[PDB]
Amino acid sequence: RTCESQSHKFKGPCLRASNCANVCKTEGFHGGKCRGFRRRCFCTKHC
């Protein structure tokens, strides 16, 4: 199961998913995905 948490470091809109995922690695997360109408970066990792 994959858990998500809004990135504390990513600024502005999330247009490219791998950018969100690379910023998420610096927060200790596995990956990251852009989500919602507000285009927020969400950090992903196993639950």
Method: X-ray
CA–CA separation, 43 and 6 (whole Å): 6
CA–CA separation, 2 and 15 (whole Å): 21
CA–CA separation, 40 and 47 (whole Å): 20
CA–CA separation, 4 and 21 (whole Å): 12
Enumerate long-range contacts of 25-33, CB under 8 Å, 24 or more apart. Answer: 29/5, 32/7, 33/4
Domain extent listing, the chain: 1-47
Please, which residues have CB within 8 angstroms of residue 43's CB and are 6 or more apart in sequence? 4, 5, 6, 7, 20, 24, 27, 29, 31, 32
Resolution in A: 2.1
Please, which residues have CB within 8 angstroms of residue 35's CB and are 6 or more apart in sequence? 4, 14, 41, 42
Residue whose entry in the numeric block shows the structure tokens 């990135």: 7
